[PDB]
Symmetry: C4
Subunit: 89 residues, 4 copies
């Protein structure tokens, strides 16, 4: 979880650096693009540079497994227990 947590953050930082410089986005919008791309939500418009498109294609393949792995350990063993160890008054 600490590790998975670190990878995800490093992955989102990379994305954020990439999209602010190549697509011209403010940091916050570039992190947002990164997270909604990798969680496969995708509610923003697509990148407008060919360079953005290529990076996004590869970023998607490398990131998704990471992000979803983090999301899965996050849910199965930081929430349910918390949540369940929670019922038992």
């Amino acid at each position: 979880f600490q590790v998975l947590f670190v990878l995800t953050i490093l992955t989102l930082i990379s994305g954020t650096i990439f999209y602010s410089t190549v697509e011209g986005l403010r940091p916050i919008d570039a992190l947002y693009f990164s997270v909604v791309t990798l969680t496969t939500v995708g509610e923003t418009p697509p990148p407008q540079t060919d360079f953005g498109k290529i990076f996004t294609i590869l970023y998607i393949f490398i990131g998704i497994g990471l992000v979803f792995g983090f999301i899965h350990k996050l849910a199965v063993n930081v929430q349910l227990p918390s949540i369940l160890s929670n019922l038992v008054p």
Copy 2:
């Protein structure tokens, strides 16, 4: 299932409260945004406030596991049985 059902509803209510106030949406559109964000459908436009963006990023990480957990118990053991206990005339 009752529990999972409750968490999902509380999660969608939070989202609904958040998006109506900070993004200025009518309740129904804010629930919709919440559900299509957390089911990773994402067919609406993205939030326009930095505050919306940040909450959405975190809401996505906490909610997805919840919503999908509910969806999964919903399908595996309220439908298939119903559906199957359904074939056998």
Copy 3:
């Protein structure tokens, strides 16, 4: 697979009937909306009626598990075998 296949089709037909009448879409665009909603792709705009929104919320929760179940049996045991029983010349 035959069963899963039937449920998915009946689910897409319902969606198609719903969106053509309430949202005013041509059959083909309503099937498309249905499939891209339930596969969580979501690349179309969202429904414009409150009635569309509500149905979509519920359609998403009931359908996703169905559609993905079909997709999963489709891939694991109509493709891989086909595909693999395919290597062995």
Copy 4:
């Protein structure tokens, strides 16, 4: 992994050929559409031809299982090991 890798590439090439000719997209935008459709991100607009819509519906059902299978072997046994066989200095 080599096999899964090949199928995904052949699947994206098909999509790319399809969307450049029928939807009139430059190769790169057609590959992009293909990848964001099959990874269920969906942040581009939808196809504008009925022919595009139909192919997309079927492409989605056949491709998703493929693409996600590749993504899953990619993550579980080209990254984690790499990543983990990485901690142990």
